[PDB]
Design an enzyme around this catalytic site. Structure first.
Site, short mmCIF file in Angstrom:
data_model
loop_
_atom_site.label_atom_id
_atom_site.label_comp_id
_atom_site.label_asym_id
_atom_site.label_seq_id
_atom_site.Cartn_x
_atom_site.Cartn_y
_atom_site.Cartn_z
N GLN A 1 0.80 -1.21 0.00
CA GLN A 1 0.00 0.00 0.00
C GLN A 1 0.86 1.29 0.00
OE1 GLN A 1 -1.85 -1.02 4.05
NE2 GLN A 1 -1.93 1.18 4.13
N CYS B 1 -5.49 0.89 3.36
CA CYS B 1 -5.62 -0.48 3.80
C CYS B 1 -7.00 -1.10 3.45
CB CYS B 1 -5.37 -0.56 5.32
SG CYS B 1 -6.47 0.50 6.29
N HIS C 1 -7.39 -0.79 10.98
CA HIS C 1 -6.66 -1.42 9.88
C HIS C 1 -7.54 -2.43 9.24
CE1 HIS C 1 -3.53 -2.72 7.32
NE2 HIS C 1 -3.01 -3.67 8.06
N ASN D 1 -1.59 -9.30 4.89
CA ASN D 1 -1.47 -7.85 5.09
C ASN D 1 -0.99 -7.24 3.77
OD1 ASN D 1 -1.52 -5.39 6.54
ND2 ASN D 1 0.15 -5.99 7.89
C1 LIG Z 1 -5.34 1.83 6.85
C2 LIG Z 1 -4.37 1.37 7.96
C3 LIG Z 1 -2.94 1.77 7.78
O1 LIG Z 1 -2.66 2.16 6.68
N1 LIG Z 1 -1.93 1.67 8.69
C4 LIG Z 1 -2.00 1.19 9.95
O2 LIG Z 1 -3.01 0.76 10.58
C5 LIG Z 1 -0.76 1.16 10.59
C6 LIG Z 1 0.09 1.62 9.57
O3 LIG Z 1 1.42 1.77 9.71
C7 LIG Z 1 2.07 1.53 10.96
C8 LIG Z 1 -0.55 2.05 8.30
C9 LIG Z 1 -0.31 3.58 8.12
C10 LIG Z 1 -0.60 4.37 9.39
C11 LIG Z 1 -1.82 4.57 10.08
N2 LIG Z 1 -1.66 5.30 11.26
C12 LIG Z 1 -0.38 5.65 11.39
C13 LIG Z 1 0.32 6.39 12.31
C14 LIG Z 1 1.71 6.58 12.14
C15 LIG Z 1 2.41 6.02 11.07
C16 LIG Z 1 1.74 5.27 10.10
C17 LIG Z 1 0.38 5.08 10.23
C18 LIG Z 1 -6.12 3.10 7.29
C19 LIG Z 1 -5.26 4.19 7.92
C20 LIG Z 1 -5.98 5.54 7.88
C21 LIG Z 1 -4.99 6.59 8.32
C22 LIG Z 1 -4.27 7.32 7.37
C23 LIG Z 1 -3.37 8.28 7.77
C24 LIG Z 1 -3.17 8.50 9.14
C25 LIG Z 1 -3.91 7.80 10.09
C26 LIG Z 1 -4.82 6.84 9.67
N3 LIG Z 1 -7.23 2.70 8.18
C27 LIG Z 1 -8.50 2.75 7.86
O4 LIG Z 1 -8.86 3.20 6.79
C28 LIG Z 1 -9.51 2.22 8.82
C29 LIG Z 1 -9.82 0.80 8.40
C30 LIG Z 1 -11.08 0.21 9.01
C31 LIG Z 1 -10.92 0.02 10.51
C32 LIG Z 1 -11.42 -1.10 8.30
N4 LIG Z 1 -10.67 3.08 8.72
C33 LIG Z 1 -10.91 3.99 9.62
O5 LIG Z 1 -10.16 4.08 10.54
C34 LIG Z 1 -12.07 4.94 9.51
C35 LIG Z 1 -11.47 6.32 9.35
C36 LIG Z 1 -12.25 7.29 8.47
C37 LIG Z 1 -12.84 6.77 7.14
C38 LIG Z 1 -11.38 8.55 8.24
N5 LIG Z 1 -12.92 4.75 10.66
C39 LIG Z 1 -13.92 3.83 10.67
O6 LIG Z 1 -14.17 3.16 9.68
C40 LIG Z 1 -14.76 3.71 11.95
C41 LIG Z 1 -15.63 2.38 12.17
C42 LIG Z 1 -14.86 1.04 12.01
C43 LIG Z 1 -16.95 2.26 11.39
N6 LIG Z 1 -15.47 5.06 12.09
C44 LIG Z 1 -16.61 5.36 11.16
C45 LIG Z 1 -15.73 5.45 13.51
#
Ligand SMILES: *[C@H](CC(=O)N1C(=O)C=C(OC)[C@@H]1Cc1c[nH]c2ccccc12)[C@H](CCc1ccccc1)NC(=O)[C@H](CC(C)C)NC(=O)[C@H](CC(C)C)NC(=O)[C@H](C(C)C)N(C)C
Length: 215
Positions: free
Chosen positions: A19, A25, A162, A182
């Site tokens: 990714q 993700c 994630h 992953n």
């Molecule tokens: C995908 C996850 C991801 O890319 N990750 C990680 O989880 C850990 C990573 O690396 C260590 C990478 C990159 C990363 C994420 N956070 C950090 C911090 C520091 C360094 C690197 C990283 C994404 C990540 C989104 C993101 C992007 C930039 C910064 C922070 C976060 N995750 C999701 O898309 C997540 C997947 C779901 C759980 C299937 N979705 C959500 O979190 C959404 C967020 C909205 C759309 C902005 N929230 C929800 O879906 C949630 C529930 C489950 C219904 N809401 C509606 C309350």
């Protein structure tokens, strides 16, 4: 349900992807699920486009995050069930900037008709997976950083953040486990896979499980 399932052994799983520095993700998980469902509905193993989702699905938020279920909805309600090939619509958000949705045409690689939300129950997810194939799941991946191998048994399980893909499980082992694909390259974990302990809702694995439906 069988004792052990690994869908990779039937030839149903595509290579581990990258990714990059984008929070896509959710799209890798969704598309992973679609690739496997399309294969198991009888079609040949096709690599499909995450970039389609990242750039074009406006219910989700691209590099800022999303949800597999929203992706499955977008595919069906806004894209007529179509999912493009990776070959014609390749990933371009590896540096963390998603390009605009394209206004060209692309080759359709697969078609879905809907998705199912699975119960919040590790045994029933296992049974459904044995029968119908890999499952898109959300997890808390806070503690996944330091992971090099083995079956993780103290996963921090506070908040879903994630999206990944269940491809198997083993209920017979000393420590039962899920087998999870992953999207962080083959250099992370076990050739890009992770095993987490099964039976104790590790990483909140059971909370948000679902799958596209082909046919
Ligand atoms: C995908 C996850 C991801 O890319 N990750 C990680 O989880 C850990 C990573 O690396 C260590 C990478 C990159 C990363 C994420 N956070 C950090 C911090 C520091 C360094 C690197 C990283 C994404 C990540 C989104 C993101 C992007 C930039 C910064 C922070 C976060 N995750 C999701 O898309 C997540 C997947 C779901 C759980 C299937 N979705 C959500 O979190 C959404 C967020 C909205 C759309 C902005 N929230 C929800 O879906 C949630 C529930 C489950 C219904 N809401 C509606 C309350």
């Amino acid at each position: 349900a069988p004792a052990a399932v690994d869908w990779r052994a039937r030839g149903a799983v595509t290579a581990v992807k990258d990714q990059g520095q984008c929070g896509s993700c959710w799209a890798f998980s969704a598309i992973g699920n679609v690739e496997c469902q399309w294969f198991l509905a009888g079609h040949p193993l096709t690599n499909l486009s995450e970039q389609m989702l990242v750039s074009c699905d406006k219910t989700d938020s691209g590099c800022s995050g999303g949800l597999m279920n929203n992706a499955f909805e977008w595919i069906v309600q806004e894209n007529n069930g179509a999912v493009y090939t990776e070959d014609s619509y390749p990933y371009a958000s590896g540096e963390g900037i998603s390009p605009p949705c394209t206004t060209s045409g692309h080759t359709v690689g697969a078609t879905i008709t809907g998705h199912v939300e699975l119960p919040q129950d590790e045994a029933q997810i296992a049974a459904w997976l044995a029968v119908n194939g890999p499952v898109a799941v959300a997890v808390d991946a806070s503690s996944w950083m330091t992971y090099t191998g083995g079956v993780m048994t103290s996963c921090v399980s506070e908040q879903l953040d994630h999206g990944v893909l269940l491809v198997g499980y083993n209920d017979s082992a000393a420590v039962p486990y899920w087998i999870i694909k992953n999207s962080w390259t083959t250099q992370w974990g076990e050739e890009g896979y992770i095993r987490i302990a099964k039976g104790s809702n590790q990483c909140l694995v059971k909370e948000e499980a679902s799958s596209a439906v082909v046919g």
